Symmetry: D3
Subunit: 173 residues, 6 copies
């Protein structure tokens, strides 16, 4: 089951992300049901938007919102919903919403999976337009869900994102 | 596992359906293998038809044919095979086949998932053409499987469909 | 060629729309090149958005912006880019942008093509969420194109939309 | 334009078919508008069916129904709508409908395009299930269009299909 | 879980294959993680190639390379990643690589799933071009993975492939 | 028609490419028929490969092989077959085949279409893996077409590619 997957083979530098929503997919928000391991349809998204990168969580972590830590994973082609990507954080996007504050990490595939991201050490090494798309997506994807808003605060770098992984790991135990 | 999912959060009005065949998909009939929870290919369909809505079953139910209770779930876009939709029955389609009688419920997503079906209380609140497509699909999708036929009997409403959910729940215990 | 297609078989009630961008498609903005009739890639869209309905124009019309009159056409499944839909206006969405003002009509397929929209006489007969998605899409799809903004003004009904078709037809001669 | 394409490089054995509806596609019936060469949406199909092979017509031919001669073309993967396949008839399917009688040829790609059909000389050299799917498709695809019915009469072979191509060619002049 | 699936309902003639990579899919190599049963992204493939048939393994088997026995399964349409096909071996492809030797079986769906392969008893009953595509795919798909090469040795028939299934079954206990 | 499209708005730095085969598409080789402007199926490709970038030609040019000059165009998402991309050459790939020598240019979208390639001035500014994929694709995509082989010679830069555009333009007059 998904519970058997460690937060990573090697901590913050070498982590696993279980993908719930593929990049470039239909506007269906899935979420792994923790009791059953099944992919639940959580929402048919209102806005006509798509996730600019694969979206999921690091197993065996806990964030402030009671869910595991959220991560976007950039890949050369979208991966299957429910599949698991070995990856490496390169940044952290901070935001405020209607329920306080939120954050999403961004990660790239481990070099065992692809050579394409060898030179991507910080989120600023990704295409500037991709970074803008991610900011714009999280700023607006809930605009048609009543009582929901999101304001983008700003980014922090790979080191701070990796620190967030470690904090979420300890928080889960 | 799928066995951990209850028939619903709240009985006949708020139920779960595990999707085996997405709407508008390739003509592959999948079926969840109960021993393993895996999606098995049960048949490469003979006819050049597709399911007009997502097709699956309510967990922890038992119908007359020894399988869990069958449900079609209407959604704004097809969901992933094996995913789980929180939904609400709005009708029941009765049929005769080569092995006696059969029935399929039709359901719409719970309001937590989408506002689009708030005003859909009965199957007659859905587009008349969709209802016709569903009747025509079940009437003909097995036409090229030898020894198989299906005749449509007629529809019953949301209340009777919900009664069928409760009967199938008790039958499973 | 596209120039041979009349604005419609029967004026404002029965019109043709040449689709440039299908509903639910990749974020590529095509535009028909009038000299060649070819589909040109006009822009790889910055935002992670998709058109909520098929987008195109009425041939042999002229709008204030020197291009033919713009129309969104709702269909049960997205149509091919460059294909031509016989349809009927049901509304007009007014907006302001960086270059003044703009408007988009919304239309449904002619009854010869589908019975699904027989009861859709006004844009308010469409799902309220679809209308919201259209407003939100045009409000934000150019957010990542520098120097571009759009503010939604409001909607007018089918009669006013049809009047716009007639005005654009006369303007083209 | 499509009018510039001959019925074939070499008569009945080596012909061109302009594809209007790809195999395995959404249930949208396109038709080439002869005045403009554009792909028109002719119908959003009622039944939940798909064409088992690519569907189109032989240019510069005329059938009894005032349209060019209809052909299904089997291919290893569906081709783009509006594209043109060099092919070779292998059979003719006869039917009765509400307007009298109808027929559809079936063809395979020319050996210049693929070696896969070298041994397919007659429609009976194709998979028996494919032939059944084609019969079942034409028998039922108009079941939800009011006042439409189709009854399958039977098949004739490659030679008779090729004779039909020649008759339709002469009929167009 | 996948571990609950037997190598087959009936040995070498009637076996199960868990599909990791669908036919005709994006160039993402998935692999089932045995500890968790989850689909892991193992590699974003370097070459611009796709698997000519569905790729996976027979559960409860063990090959020389410490992984379960590899099988390609031919189907009329690609199946979902992670789904399970009841099938029957028809051949065995032998190869040498950088780590010694390797082999892949090829199988067709059980007659309960489809009649299309009733007459396919040996791999030489499949289209010759498909067999060539499979040879060419395995010969070249790792060409852009550093230090990887594959040379095709040749094929053996259905009986030898079935013997390989039995050997791998005993090896797993 | 396509003949009305100039080789470019501004010569070698600002050119048009008519796409015949989209990136990441089914293995169908289309070719624009010059007499009719229609997209012809030229070949169902034997190898299980896909074009790593959109493939087409510069209108109103002539290469040594009697066809217009060939170009690969890199885009963030594949474009529709038959569509036209405003782009800019960044490199030239030289090869030998069974009929002597061949070459393919590689280009990126004009800045009016996307900001993503502003810093891509030479083919060596693209991902090294993409360049390898292109070399490997042309080296092997005809391996299963009898009597066809291709050997890669090497690359030249943007300036030489642009010189090739000018030579092909003059050659067409
Ligand atoms: Mg969260
Ligand atoms: Mg049942
Ligand atoms: Mg405009
Ligand atoms: Mg006809
Ligand atoms: Mg192996
Ligand atoms: Mg050439
Ligand atoms: Na809101
Ligand atoms: Na039957
Ligand atoms: Na802006
Ligand atoms: Na009828
Ligand atoms: Na290598
Ligand atoms: Na060869």
């Amino acid at each position: 089951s998904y519970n058997n997957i460690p937060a990573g083979k090697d901590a913050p530098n070498d982590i696993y992300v279980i993908i719930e929503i593929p990049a470039n997919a239909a506007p269906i928000k899935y979420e792994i049901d923790k009791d059953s391991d099944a992919l639940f349809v959580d929402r048919f998204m209102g806005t006509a938007m798509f996730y600019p990168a694969n979206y999921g969580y690091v197993p065996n972590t806990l964030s402030e919102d009671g869910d595991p830590l959220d991560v976007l994973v950039v890949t050369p082609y979208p991966v299957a919903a429910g599949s698991v990507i070995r990856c490496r954080p390169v940044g952290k996007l901070n935001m405020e919403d209607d329920g306080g504050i939120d954050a999403k990490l961004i990660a790239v595939p481990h070099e065992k999976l692809s050579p394409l991201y060898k030179d991507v050490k910080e989120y600023t090494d990704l295409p500037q337009l991709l970074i803008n798309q991610v900011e714009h997506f999280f700023s607006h994807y809930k605009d048609l869900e009543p009582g929901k808003w999101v304001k983008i605060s700003g980014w922090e770098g790979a080191d701070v994102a990796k620190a967030e992984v470690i904090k979420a790991i300890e928080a889960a135990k």
